[PDB]
Design a protein around this ligand. Structure first.
Ligand SMILES: *[C@@H]1O[C@H](CO)[C@@H](O[C@@H]2O[C@H](CO)[C@@H](O[C@@H]3O[C@H](CO[C@H]4O[C@H](CO)[C@@H](O)[C@H](O)[C@@H]4O)[C@@H](O)[C@H](O[C@H]4O[C@H](CO)[C@@H](O)[C@H](O)[C@@H]4O)[C@@H]3O[C@@H]3OC[C@@H](O)[C@H](O)[C@H]3O)[C@H](O)[C@H]2NC(C)=O)[C@H](O[C@@H]2O[C@@H](C)[C@@H](O)[C@@H](O)[C@@H]2O)[C@H]1NC(C)=O
Ligand SMILES: *[C@@H]1O[C@H](CO)[C@@H](O[C@@H]2O[C@H](CO)[C@@H](O[C@@H]3O[C@H](CO[C@H]4O[C@H](CO)[C@@H](O)[C@H](O)[C@@H]4O)[C@@H](O)[C@H](O[C@H]4O[C@H](CO)[C@@H](O)[C@H](O)[C@@H]4O)[C@@H]3O[C@@H]3OC[C@@H](O)[C@H](O)[C@H]3O)[C@H](O)[C@H]2NC(C)=O)[C@H](O[C@@H]2O[C@@H](C)[C@@H](O)[C@@H](O)[C@@H]2O)[C@H]1NC(C)=O
Ligand SMILES: *[C@@H]1O[C@H](CO)[C@@H](O[C@@H]2O[C@H](CO)[C@@H](O[C@@H]3O[C@H](CO)[C@@H](O)[C@H](O)[C@@H]3O[C@@H]3OC[C@@H](O)[C@H](O)[C@H]3O)[C@H](O)[C@H]2NC(C)=O)[C@H](O[C@@H]2O[C@@H](C)[C@@H](O)[C@@H](O)[C@@H]2O)[C@H]1NC(C)=O
Ligand SMILES: *[C@@H]1O[C@H](CO)[C@@H](O[C@@H]2O[C@H](CO)[C@@H](O[C@@H]3O[C@H](CO)[C@@H](O)[C@H](O)[C@@H]3O[C@@H]3OC[C@@H](O)[C@H](O)[C@H]3O)[C@H](O)[C@H]2NC(C)=O)[C@H](O[C@@H]2O[C@@H](C)[C@@H](O)[C@@H](O)[C@@H]2O)[C@H]1NC(C)=O
Ligand SMILES: *[C@@H]1O[C@H](CO)[C@@H](O[C@@H]2O[C@H](CO)[C@@H](O)[C@H](O)[C@H]2NC(C)=O)[C@H](O)[C@H]1NC(C)=O
Ligand SMILES: *[C@@H]1O[C@H](CO)[C@@H](O[C@@H]2O[C@H](CO)[C@@H](O)[C@H](O)[C@H]2NC(C)=O)[C@H](O)[C@H]1NC(C)=O
Ligand SMILES: *[C@@H]1O[C@H](CO)[C@@H](O[C@@H]2O[C@H](CO)[C@@H](O)[C@H](O)[C@H]2NC(C)=O)[C@H](O)[C@H]1NC(C)=O
Ligand SMILES: *[C@@H]1O[C@H](CO)[C@@H](O[C@@H]2O[C@H](CO)[C@@H](O)[C@H](O)[C@H]2NC(C)=O)[C@H](O)[C@H]1NC(C)=O
Ligand code: NAG
Ligand code: NAG
Ligand code: NAG
Ligand code: NAG
Ligand code: NAG
Ligand code: NAG
Ligand code: NAG
Ligand code: NAG
Ligand code: NAG
Ligand code: NAG
Ligand code: NAG
Ligand code: NAG
Ligand code: ZN
Lengths: 499, 499
């Protein structure tokens, strides 16, 4: 019988008690990255994260940081491989920058051979060290040209441009890459990119944020989400019809959270909690498992919710071999009004829920996850049991899928000096406590989880935060980015992997 | 009788001997800037100078600098006005960033109202201080979307997108702006952007520079130059047909140089010198004055030189009310082979000339202009008489045009400390020696020159050089960009203007 801790102090950093041998022999352990966050702009065209961070520097991070140079994995990809080799990792998730291989967006405009060569060399280097690549086609970095031609995922033109990009990736890299992710965190671009305008491309209703160049936060999230699902599904169909000889697997990436009632004896909070599951997870998992959006979304969102045709429904339903599930934290849910006629209405209001990290009796859900220095009542707290609850829910609700945990990690402040930054015991605690619950759910609930990739390989540009936080298991000096030095967490993870 | 110095030491920094009163009462004196170089990316979309500097950081400058934040004239435009007011300047040349007012490139995709407001406030502030705006529509910063959709000026689609952009500018700003420049330095994008790939977008033949993503240095410069002329001419026709009520004037910007024979008794060097005038100046001025390219270009370039239809010829011929002439330096010319079958052939080779700053007897043409620390035999030297020779030539060869000198200036090294940087006596010498010759040519040759704008108002991002050189008449601290402090040159220029 497995017992796992939910509160500080944690004792799962002892590899005598928790290590890779606790999991099945074939289980993959590694780390993750994304292209905007690590590569730099050298050698690629411009994408909407370049555009957004440059047009709206205060939205890029408090330091106005961006991905222009970052950790320079364009130059230092071998050093990334070296970290993975030091870890004895068996997996690495990275993304392909669309703008590096097709700078002009549309494949018929030509490819960048040198960009293709960059990923060939990375892939070959990984495989030579026994590391399985997990490759994200689209980690938010849409070529700027496509956003300017037709507003990107706002328009159905995205589907064929994404398909042709993906086809090039399968053609060039699929002989070696056997695990593909289509779109990173399906929920995020619709809501943050087109709802709150916290993320690229930065569209919203005028009264939500007067700096947005255009948008409608009530309608566009739904349009974009719908196009994401269709573009994803078209790529999965292309993969499974035209690249079956490659013997690989493909799936989407979800951001997952668990949700608990703010007041577990209040029917209204219980209802809000179940609505959140539907609106947060079901928005995408309903289509992916059934070809339809959840009924509560149909009912609430009404004419703002697009319909799938019968052909589209069939294309989207079942459009995965596995799910990449990202998991960071859990929220309490309580009811909230949905003012659909307000000029500041957002899609996110349609769930009719307010989310907190403290429940009605004043209980904080778990240890600190992210401090918010401008408003401490907005601090985020984590909840290790949430990974158990999410995986159990996916198994039970969503037809026992094959799952890889494609991100899980925690930040430390960029204000810490290097010695403090390397002494990242809070990261060991977060990672181990989640791994304990992941082992527990696999054993107790028989969830088909076959790997775990911690966020992040190394310090990088963090969307929305610049270089003001660090997520890496290895440390990068922003004054001299060449080295990636394993932190205490990376050293712990090395021991966990090879105990 | 006016006597002007050609060699150090110069004594024209004495405003007792040379000042604004030496020129006609109406003559405009000011300074110049461009949008990529000064504004920053905040509040605008991405353009090909963002793309180029980010994809090819070693081509942005030795420091890998770029226009992301620069002097932040987005925030500090009032401080630019303040410099101009301190100078008692009567003119200011600035550019509109296309990506700030139409981030999606094509006008039908929507405009950025806040971008429009930015230029309205600048323009209104200038006029309130008695400063005449000279506004460049296109200072190289093409929206990235257009380059990615159709490769920008490589394709005739540029013409209508440029026209619709210009129409928006005339509509929004032409009630106040009475001097418009279409395209900055017509020669530069074809040759550097599409020939040598030193400049955005960075296209060339594969053996010219293997880093180029695509291109053909032998053909594309000509295509791009042809489209520039057509796009320019379509905008001038639009202006003069639809905006005549505004009572303003429009013209192109030329980069001018003079050319002297490397050996003034050698017929081959004399011939190369005359070819250079045709290939450098006539490439554009032939079309602008006659609707045809120079015969030597027709003959040499052959099938690589596009033809104008009779309608196009008529549109381009006479498509200016004035010329903005930029002038920095003069070169000696000697013959050079034109290897049209070589895989590394460039359009620039078609002139059949090699350019130097030292003549056959070892004479350097004038004082140092720009030191090249990697190769000192590649140092640039200036030649004050060249402004006289250029203006005389334009009057005689090109039908006595109205001229404004739209740039003239010199750099100092970014390695200098602030006190050295503010003690910019080399800049006084360059500016005064050229102003002396400009007065001389107006008086002696009756060239219709009606203003002079020195490059640059303040230190900025220099194309190709990052922040490794400074051109400003006012100093900017890159650690805190708010202030623009007049250098010795700016203080001199203040006295020259109001002696
Ligand atoms: C998994 O996918 C299944 C589909 O493959 C989902 O089942 C569908 O659920 C639909 C409701 O979401 C349901 O459709 C309703 O059908 C009513 C019956 O119509 C038939 O008989 C009519 C009925 O009197 C007639 O007009 C129709 O022409 C048919 O003959 C119908 O009125 C409904 O329309 C009203 O409600 C929708 C909102 O739900 C409004 O958008 C619409 O304007 C109208 O106001 C609805 O019809 C659907 O209307 C929209 C139109 O685009 C669709 O094509 C039309 O179908 C449908 O019958 C079933 N299909 C079957 C095969 O069962 C299933 O939903 C879950 O299970 C069903 C039983 C129900 O409990 C749902 O609430 C659950 O979500 C999906 N499962 C999951 C887990 O999501
Ligand atoms: C200012 O613009 C003026 C035009 O408005 C320029 O004058 C034109 O100069 C053209 C040469 O560049 C000249 O065209 C040549 O015409 C030859 C005569 O053709 C007529 O009689 C024929 C002759 O036997 C017959 O086939 C034609 O159908 C006509 O009836 C002719 O062969 C020439 O073609 C050969 O040379 C061109 C290269 O120059 C090759 O491209 C072509 O394949 C061929 O090998 C040339 O014809 C032009 O051919 C190209 C085609 O696209 C053009 O439409 C065709 O016209 C033309 O006659 C005159 N036009 C007039 C009205 O004078 C003027 O040029 C300068 O002055 C002229 C006198 C000459 O000295 C030029 O070298 C100078 O540049 C321009 N001025 C300046 C300063 O540039
Ligand atoms: C978790 O949710 C539960 C369920 O909602 C909360 O308990 C409910 O709390 C209500 C007060 O917020 C209680 O109603 C009140 O009852 C007193 C005594 O009769 C009365 O004077 C009030 O006016 C009020 O009555 C309601 O007024 C509004 C009418 O529309 C409605 O019909 C009336 O019910 C309610 O009885 C209680 N329900 C239960 C089943 O206990 C619970 O609140 C926490 O516990 C209750 C017992 C009370 O001590 C609250 O102070 C305390 O906050 C909530 N838990 C937390 C931690 O918020
Ligand atoms: C400025 O250009 C002028 C004109 O080209 C240069 O003068 C010419 O310089 C040529 C040498 O580069 C002289 O030709 C040579 O004459 C000597 C004496 O006969 C002879 O032994 C050589 O072989 C050579 O003759 C040529 O060989 C190649 C044959 O195809 C050709 O037919 C022969 O001419 C040439 O006479 C001279 N022309 C004139 C009109 O003087 C001039 O060069 C400079 O001055 C000359 C006089 C000489 O002192 C050169 O050393 C010196 O460089 C050049 N000025 C500069 C500074 O480069
Ligand atoms: C978001 O787009 C929706 C749909 O176009 C706009 O909502 C509508 O508003 C028009 C004008 O009021 C209404 O007549 C419709 O009844 C509404 N339709 C629905 C589906 O709600 C909403 O004004 C736009 N919001 C913003 C801020 O522009
Ligand atoms: C807030 O969260 C706390 C902690 O999960 C809940 O408290 C638990 O309540 C259960 C059922 O009453 C008790 O058995 C436990 O002993 C309590 N745990 C502790 C740490 O207090 C609490 O019920 C939640 N409040 C609401 C209103 O939902
Ligand atoms: C530049 O484009 C020119 C024109 O397409 C290419 O030049 C031609 O080369 C083809 C193949 O040799 C030739 O048959 C033609 O005779 C040439 N045409 C002319 C007008 O010169 C040139 O190969 C291309 N250069 C590069 C590096 O791709
Ligand atoms: C190189 O440039 C120098 C300077 O312009 C030329 O020298 C002048 O030559 C003229 C005509 O012979 C003499 O009258 C001057 O006195 C010379 N000036 C000085 C400063 O020497 C020289 O002729 C040029 N060389 C060539 C080969 O063209
Ligand atoms: C691995 O952890 C298991 C408990 O899951 C433990 O029994 C085993 O001895 C540990 N391995 C090492 C080498 O410490
Ligand atoms: C940040 O930038 C936007 C312009 O993009 C401006 O609207 C907003 O006021 C600025 N935010 C703060 C908090 O200053
Ligand atoms: C598959 O490849 C063939 C060859 O390009 C193409 O005809 C077919 O449409 C593609 N298939 C998809 C997505 O099924
Ligand atoms: C607009 O929304 C903000 C945040 O969503 C809220 O605090 C404010 O009350 C809203 N105003 C109206 C008019 O509803
Ligand atoms: C930068 O870091 C690398 C790796 O530690 C080191 O070899 C190189 O010398 C350092 N550069 C400077 C300028 O210190
Ligand atoms: C790498 O992991 C394999 C598999 O568990 C193990 O056999 C090998 O010893 C490990 N190597 C190192 C250096 O830890
Ligand atoms: C201006 O320069 C002229 C010579 O061009 C001179 O005569 C005049 O006195 C100077 N003005 C002043 C105020 O020094
Ligand atoms: C600069 O960058 C390019 C890649 O864009 C590379 O091809 C070239 O070798 C580098 N230049 C130098 C001098 O290192
Ligand atoms: C002028 O404006 C009118 C109204 O848009 C348009 O019909 C006409 O084509 C434009 N003219 C140009 C470039 O001449
Ligand atoms: C190619 O050109 C470079 C510079 O243009 C030159 O130095 C080299 O000799 C040329 N090579 C050939 C094959 O002509
Ligand atoms: C930056 O420069 C401005 C103008 O001199 C000054 O007022 C401001 O205090 C300076 N900021 C810092 C942080 O020194
Ligand atoms: C501004 O220039 C005008 C025109 O020459 C002159 O009358 C006025 O005195 C000058 N002002 C200053 C402060 O120099
Ligand atoms: Zn940047």
């Amino acid at each position: 019988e497995i017992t796992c801790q939910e509160n500080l102090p944690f004792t799962c950093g002892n590899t005598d008690a928790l290590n890779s041998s606790s999991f099945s022999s074939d289980f993959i352990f590694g780390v993750a990255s994304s292209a905007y966050q690590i590569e730099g702009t050298i050698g690629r065209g411009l994408n909407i994260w370049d555009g957004f961070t440059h047009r709206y520097p205060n939205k890029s991070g408090p330091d106005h940081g961006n991905g222009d140079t970052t950790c320079d994995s364009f130059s230092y990809w071998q050093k990334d491989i070296d970290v993975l080799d030091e870890l004895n990792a068996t997996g690495y998730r990275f993304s392909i920058a669309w703008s590096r291989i097709i700078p002009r967006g549309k494949r018929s405009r030509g490819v960048n051979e040198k960009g293709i060569d960059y990923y060939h060399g990375l892939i070959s280097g990984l495989i030579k060290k026994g590391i399985t690549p997990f490759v994200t086609l689209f980690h938010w970095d849409l070529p700027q040209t496509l956003q300017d031609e037709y507003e990107g995922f706002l328009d159905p033109q995205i589907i064929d441009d994404f398909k042709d990009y993906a086809d090039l990736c399968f053609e060039e890299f699929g002989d070696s890459v056997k695990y593909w992710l289509t779109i990173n965190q399906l929920y995020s671009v619709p809501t943050r990119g087109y709802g709150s305008a916290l993320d690229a491309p930065g569209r919203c209703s005028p009264t939500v944020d007067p700096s947005c160049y255009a948008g409608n936060s009530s309608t566009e999230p739904y349009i974009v989400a719908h196009h994401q699902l269709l573009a994803h599904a078209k790529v999965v169909d292309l993969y499974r019809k035209n690249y079956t000889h490659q013997g690989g697997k493909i799936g989407p990436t979800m951001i997952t959270r668990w949700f608990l009632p703010y007041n577990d004896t209040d029917r209204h909070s219980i209802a809000a909690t179940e609505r959140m599951k539907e609106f947060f997870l079901g928005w995408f998992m309903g289509p992916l498992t059934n070809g339809t959006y959840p009924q509560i979304m149909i009912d609430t969102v009404g004419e703002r919710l697009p319909s799938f045709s019968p052909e589209e429904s069939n294309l989207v339903k079942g459009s995965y071999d596995f799910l990449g599930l990202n998991y960071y934290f859990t929220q309490y849910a309580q009811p909230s009004p949905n003012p659909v006629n307000s000029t500041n209405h957002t899609a996110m209001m349609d769930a009719g829920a307010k989310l907190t990290y403290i429940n009605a009796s004043g209980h904080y859900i778990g240890p600190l996850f992210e401090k918010d220095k401008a408003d401490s009542t907005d601090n985020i707290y984590y909840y290790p049991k949430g990974i158990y609850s999410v995986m159990d829910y996916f198994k039970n609700k969503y037809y026992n899928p094959l799952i890889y945990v494609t991100e899980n990690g925690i930040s430390t402040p960029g204000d810490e000096n290097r010695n403090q930054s390397m002494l990242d015991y809070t990261r060991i605690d977060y990672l181990c406590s989640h791994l304990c619950f992941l082992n527990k759910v696999i054993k107790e609930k028989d969830v088909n989880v076959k790997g775990y990739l911690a966020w992040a390989l190394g310090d990088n540009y963090e969307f929305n935060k610049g270089f003001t936080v660090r997520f890496g298991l290895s440390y990068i000096d922003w004054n001299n980015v060449t080295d990636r030095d394993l932190k205490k967490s990376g050293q712990w993870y090395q021991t966990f992997i090879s105990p």
